[PDB]
């Protein structure tokens, strides 16, 4: 439940 935010940060840009 963290990498997955790190994951998204990854589709933020």
């Known amino acids: 439940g963290l990498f ?3 994951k998204k940060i ?3 840009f």
Do not use: L, P, R, T
């Open 4 to 6: 997955d935010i790190i």
């Open 10 to 12: 990854a589709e933020s």
